[PDB]
Structure 1
Amino acid sequence: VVDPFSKKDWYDVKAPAMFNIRNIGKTLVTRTQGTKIASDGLKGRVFEVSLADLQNDEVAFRKFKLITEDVQGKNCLTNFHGMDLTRDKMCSMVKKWQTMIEAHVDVKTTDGYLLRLFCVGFTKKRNNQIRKTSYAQHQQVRQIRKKMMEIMTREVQTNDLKEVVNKLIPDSIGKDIEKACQSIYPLHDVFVRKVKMLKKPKFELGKLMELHGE
């Protein structure tokens, strides 16, 4: 008899200023009922959204997670939580008769935002190549995989979270190990497959208010 949707109000979700489209969408939550207050029911919600509705002309096979850390009245401010690729991209690039090399590393930034980076690469068939198997040897794989994680340890350890997350809207990490590996075995589909968040540095309030500033 009661309609619980008549007790619910709409907030709108905002992405940080690092992206072109600042407005993610609208969520809903029930109002305050004593100890059930209407803010902790939507702190820590994940919004699995892609780039192409968060940039203007960027790719669509990549998606960002965006936890909520603060509520500003009718607004619902967010911070970065992680990324991965879609399923259909990540299994369109796993084909036969090529080597899949994959690396992973735990690197924290200088802001205290410990990440786990996941990167893949696939060996590349050459243009004049006649034989079928474009396989790598095993000691080639070990030194490529050493070369992958050494580079993304550079690109994350040195500076803060904003320049890190800004590097992988164009995915210049996958393009930097693209150039640095093709004197070992050439690679072609080299992405950062997934970024996972391990830590958060106690949530200073003004750091989120910087991200939604200019």
Structure 2
Amino acid sequence: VVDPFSKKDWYDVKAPAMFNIRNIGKTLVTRTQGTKIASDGLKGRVFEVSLADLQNDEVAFRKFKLITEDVQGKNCLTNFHGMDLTRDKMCSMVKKWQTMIEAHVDVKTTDGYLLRLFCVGFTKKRNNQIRKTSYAQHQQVRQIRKKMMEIMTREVQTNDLKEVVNKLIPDSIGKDIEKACQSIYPLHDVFVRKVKMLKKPKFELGKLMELHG
């Protein structure tokens, strides 16, 4: 009958100043008929983007959830939302002869943003090791867990969203945790496997404007 695809319009999703490459892409939104504002229906999107696409030198398995908030007239302003590992990597890590270790913290940053940060680590096989399995006793595991918690808590609690994501991109936090826990047990692969968002501060234009440029 009537082509719905002629009432559609093209917009440009561009990332924040945090990463290198700016334009993540195009988004398709039906035009305003006045009953429904197209700026509003476009306001709530999550964008799943690979880290390799935003910054040229990094690994593929880090994905970022990015939220549009304000529309600039065919420019979409995106703020950080979430982060996660590609399923493939996640599975690639897990194996049958090693202890896995997990922990999480709920931290308010200095600008008020509320984040759930997840941490995954592994008992590493030693280099000359004859014994088939690497296993950490429960107390050791609890120790390591406690230290992860401590570390990332200290990392986020001191700083605002900016520096946090900046630490998330290379993942300074992971190598931090690996390094520090070497006394308890030689951890292997250690990441922030997921980042969640619980409470955003009341929306302010200026903050986001600063964040973009």
> How many angstroms does 1:42 deviate by?
1.0
Structure number having the greater helix percentage: 2
Q: TM-score, structure 2 length as denominator? A: 0.99
Q: Deviations over 1:176-212 (max 9, x none)?
A: 0010001101011100000000011011101110111
The separation in 2 between residues aligned to 1:74 and 1:169, in whole angstroms, is 27
The separation in 2 between residues aligned to 1:86 and 1:58, in whole angstroms, is 14
> How many angstroms does 1:35 deviate by?
2.3
Query: Match of 1:16, SS?
Result: coil
The separation in 2 between residues aligned to 1:55 and 1:97, in whole angstroms, is 35
Displacement over 3 Å in runs of 4+ = none
> How many angstroms does 1:107 deviate by?
0.4
The separation in 1 between residues aligned to 2:16 and 2:107, in whole angstroms, is 23
**Which runs of structure 2 are paired with 1:1-214 in the superposition (5 Å)?**
1-213=1-213
> How many angstroms does 1:155 deviate by?
0.6
Query: Match of 1:91, SS?
Result: helix
> How many angstroms does 1:109 deviate by?
0.3
- Unaligned segments of structure 1, at least 5 residues: none
Query: Match of 2:84, SS?
Result: strand
Q: Deviations over 1:92-127 (max 9, x none)?
A: 100011010000010010101100000100100001
Q: Deviations over 1:130-182 (max 9, x none)?
A: 01110000000000000001000011001111001110100010110010001
The separation in 1 between residues aligned to 2:33 and 2:209, in whole angstroms, is 28
The separation in 1 between residues aligned to 2:5 and 2:166, in whole angstroms, is 38
Query: Match of 2:106, SS?
Result: strand
Further displaced range: 2-11 or 33-42: 33-42
Tell me the C-alpha RMSD between the 2 structures. Answer: 0.6
Q: Deviations over 1:37-57 (max 9, x none)?
A: 111111110000011110011
% same residue: 100
The separation in 2 between residues aligned to 1:52 and 1:92, in whole angstroms, is 18
The separation in 2 between residues aligned to 1:151 and 1:194, in whole angstroms, is 16
- Unaligned segments of structure 2, at least 5 residues: none
